[PDB]
Amino acid sequence: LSRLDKVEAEVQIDRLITGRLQSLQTYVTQQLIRAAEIRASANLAATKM
Amino acid sequence: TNVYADSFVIRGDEVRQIAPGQTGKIADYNYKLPDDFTGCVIAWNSNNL
């Protein structure tokens, strides 16, 4: 923001928006894959208990 | 919905700042076109008149 005029400063930060969100989308996707895995273990633990 | 027909006269070497979002003396102090501007910008030499 502090080096580029607003006419095209949105373009570069847009790449961060597409970028930083993309990592967030991957992290949550990793989480659900791990979230389901734990519940399978948890349900196994539930039966064990 | 509606039409805005803006009329003004400037130097011929001044049209660059008319582009949306651009900056300088024009877009800083006298004429700021919106970022989401919708339309066409028309100019022609008028030294004779």
H-type helices in B1-49, by residue range? 25
Resolution (A): 4.1
User: Distance between CA A5 and CA A1 in Å, rounded?
Assistant: 7
The answer to whether residues B20 and B35 touch, using CB atoms and an 8 Å cutoff, is: yes
Residues of A with CB under 8 A from a CB of B: 5-8
| Inter-chain CB proximity A5 and B20 less than 8 Å | no
HSE-up of residue A26 (Cα within 13 Å, Cβ side): 5
Q: How far is CA A30 from CA A17, A19, A25, A39, in A?
A: 20, 17, 9, 14
| Inter-chain CB proximity A6 and B19 less than 8 Å | no
| Phi/psi at B30 (5° precision) | -130, -30
- CB contacts < 8 A, A to B, total 13
> How is residue A3 written in tokens?
């080096």
The answer to whether residues B23 and A5 touch, using CB atoms and an 8 Å cutoff, is: yes
CB-count burial class (<10 Å; 0-12, 13-18, 19+) for B3: exposed
